[model samples]
Target: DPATLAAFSAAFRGELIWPSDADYDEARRIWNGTIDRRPALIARCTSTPDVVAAVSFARKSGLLVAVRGGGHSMAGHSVCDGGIVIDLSLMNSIKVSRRLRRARAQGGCLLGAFDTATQAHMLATPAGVVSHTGLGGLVLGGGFGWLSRKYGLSIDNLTSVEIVTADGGVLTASDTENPDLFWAVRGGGGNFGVVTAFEFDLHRVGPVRFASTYYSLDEGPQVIRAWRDHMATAPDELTWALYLRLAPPLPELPADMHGKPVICAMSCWIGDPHEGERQLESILHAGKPHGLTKATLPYRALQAYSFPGAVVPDRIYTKSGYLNELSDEATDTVLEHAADIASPFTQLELLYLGGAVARVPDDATAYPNRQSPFVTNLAAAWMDPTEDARHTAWAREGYRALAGHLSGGYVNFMNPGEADRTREAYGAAKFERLQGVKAKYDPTNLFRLNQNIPP
Candidate 1:
């Protein structure tokens, strides 16, 4: 074990944070407050060479290896309990080619970092709703966000990637080279290898336009139906999310609204603010909302509105799926069960997806079910470790009602306990293809975290 530690230390220019190290606890931590795994070694890789060396050392030693880019994995896939962690936190670099509208980013770069770099050029790519999510896992798992309804999933904008394969070989996958690997990487949840860098095809977003906003719970049902109907004909420039949440009970809100159910519709308009304001007027004026969290702000400002602050480091259980239609029955279930959430950290969110995302053919890449009308996510976050069983049971029961109308779920939002539901996330054909690719690239299944694709 000491020998392995020494080798890992020598493998990277960045520090190797061991359990005995001063920063070990902080270093091993990830975004989900719930996960508490002690990695054997946290190899903070500074460059691709560092990544390759770490991977080679782990392979020879037959040690389990987990790759962490942004460390925001909801399923706690970024770090392994007793495995070597190939931490990419040090590789947070972004290089943009404004003339070509392309950007090269290190795997560790978060959406905010990418946005900052690209926004200088008035360009962007689809990213997660939360600004802190890593570009690596999010893109690999079919990135979705305000821009999704317009540009398509984040993977759709990905042009290429530099990955280190299972054999410790450095390779590039893109449209012109290793296209199959490119296809697989698009929506393939880190199965192929440890992607060290990514090159994204950027689009001209805005200096300023319509983006996102929030409302309160009393307006939820009406706002939900309004959003469903509005998205049916909304321009691709517009995207929305209905959040059923309890006010944080901060002094900013009336005490009556605190600890009370409220509905908020988050919207993003990637067009002119004038027209964007016109488009958002209905929801802005929806009923006497508890509060309005966003007005037309700079695209960058609006982009960071929902940033998940410093990791809470608690236990979290999440379930998500794509629905073909939010039928009356499904809407009622969402309305009823969402209000009955027993956990303070529990939340139900609805994201409308159509426009460009659905336009992609079903078999275009590993990501399928694009035509699904909408996506829903249920999350239970709690600090008490003892409440795990109760929280998990509640999540499962809510999912049973929610899944009744869903076609499939997103892999990124899956819980570790739902290995059987993995198939539903990727369906049969897509899952098989992903498996075939996984077998080819990682025959030994070295990258066994996230929604793992078995070899």
Candidate 2:
């Protein structure tokens, strides 16, 4: 074992950290503070060859494997106990071609870095809301964000991906090269391989009309209902969501209203700012506003803007699902749970789906749930570990209350130990096809640490 380890270490160019190393703890640290894992080793790969060597070493040595990009997995799948973590955080680099309107980034890049690089050229692609989220994991899990309604999911913009499969072979997956793998990676959640680089089709995007209103909790039902109705006819150039949480102290809000529960409706219009302002005016009528803010801001600013209730390094747990329709009954169920949040950091987010996301043919990619009109995420974040049960139960109960109205859950939001729900997330046919791809590429399931689609 020592001989093999030494050989592998000699061949690797990046840092190979063991448990005894002084940097092990810091290297293993991830976004969710609740994930306390002690991996046997952390291979911080710097190049494709380093990744191949690390993956080959793990395969030959029979070690469990976890893949770390931005280390933002809410399910904590980015690191594992008694396993080898293929840490790709150091591989972050970007090459943008302004002529081709495309950008290729190393798999370990975060949304913030991706945005900063692309925005320099006045270009962007759809991605997640959080700036710190991993580009690889987010794209593979069917990314959604403010621009999704306009350009579709992050996966939809992907032109190609360079991935190292379970066997340590590097391959390019795209529409023409390894088309099956390309389709799988679009929404397959890293079951096939560790992506080394991702090439995305970029679009011109810049200053957008952003409007938001904070409504008293008492008006949540009416506000939510009206918002839903308005979004039903909203154009693809506009995307919005509702955040049900306690108000944060802001210069725009009265101090007395701070820390009180409120309904926040945030909208972004990527078209003409004047038309955007006119369209967003309807939101103010939804309720008696506790506070309202409207501005013309860069798309990058929206990508990096930190919403009130969420912060990293907190013990975070979440449950999410797709709602076929935000029916009146569903609205009541969510509001009822929103009123009983266990932690001040907990929030209920209702993201408007459809538009471009649904317009894509369901069978075109591994991502399912195309017809679902909304996605609801109940996220609980707290500092004290002792309150884990309390916070988790609050989220679970909220999920259960809305279960009658929801069908499939989002793979990225499915918590650990939710194998059954993961299957449902992809639907029956898509799940079966994903398994075929997994069997072909990762038959031994070395990459089961993710929301796995096992062989």
Candidate 3:
């Protein structure tokens, strides 16, 4: 074993942690606590050369290899049980240029890390909601956030990606060079290669109004109906999500309503604070919510607040799909399931996803389904592993019940059993194109650990 590691260590500049090492156990622990894996080795890469060496060693050994950056692959695809892990945790870094409104982030950089660098210049981009989510997976899977309606998906803003292909070659994919590979990774998951760095066009964003309001179940149904009407009329600067889930025990809510299942109107207004307040008038009147709280904070602070839903590692079952339209029958299906979900912590979310997101042409990038009006997520996050089956089943069946109304499901929100669903995310035509890219760049499918796209 030492001999094997020594061969890699001779040319590698990063840490090569063996299975018997002290940090082996801790090194394999990923974001999802449910994923308990033991890798044969962990190659914590510090640079592009280190990543190249790790990939080469993995291929030569014929071992199952998984790449780990921010390590939030809920399906546990980032680390294998008895293989090498090309850990990119040591590669986190970011650099922002204000005048150009552009930023570059290493593949391992967390959402918060890049946000911190860009916000220093009053600049931002449409990225993932959670702070710890990896830029590598999120962007590669078509990321969205509060800024999506205003700016676009994270991949829409991407200028270039520096990648390590299966052949251990370091290359940059962009509009000017290796354009096909660049197009494939836009929403094609991690099948193409390991992206070591990313460049994005940032936008000027500042403090604004972000609001959260909760209503009773009786009013929730009514609120849902109201949202369906209001969403179409709202300006692009505002983004909203209607959530049906158990309420947190907070002083702002009515005592009887606390800990009860309720519908929440979570809206973010990305424009001027006063203008945003004015824009939310219809929402305030339509919901007539029982209790509400609003906060006006910097965009970065708002992004940080979203992490609570993601901060804790749990047995999280997420099943999602895109809705061409949020009809009442579809809304009823979600309501029926949310009422007696396996876990009170379960959330049935309907996010309005059209405006700027839809404006992009079908042939512009690899990401399809721009015409889908809403993206719905059924999530059950629980603490105890014993309760996994219950929550998992509820989420699984919940998506099944609404399948009749489903369209293109977002790839980022997908959990296992992904072959058909991967096709669902990218339709038949785009998937065929992705297959060609897979064949060209990675014919052997070295990166098959993700939502595998077989060459």
Say which candidate scores most in TM-score. 2
Give Cα distance to truth, residue 327, candidate 2, Å: 1.5
Per-residue lDDT over 1-79 for candidate 1, one digit per residue giving the tens place of the 0 to 100 score: 6776577567668877878988999998888767788987788888999999898888878778898888878777888
Query: Once superposed on the true structure, which residue ranges of model 2 sit more than 4 Å away at CA?
Result: 308-313
lDDT of 3: 0.82
Best by lDDT: 2
By TM-score, the candidates rank as 2, 3, 1
TM-score of 1: 0.93
Better of 2 and 3 by lDDT: 2
Model 3: what TM-score? 0.96
- Pick by TM-score: 2 or 3, better one: 2
C-alpha positional error of residue 315 in candidate 2 after TM-score superposition, expressed in Å: 0.4
Determine which window of 10 residues in candidate 3 has minimal summed lDDT: 306-315
Q: What's the CA RMSD for each of the models?
A: 2.4, 1.4, 1.7
* Candidate order (lDDT): 2, 3, 1
How high is the CA lDDT of each candidate model?
0.78, 0.86, 0.82
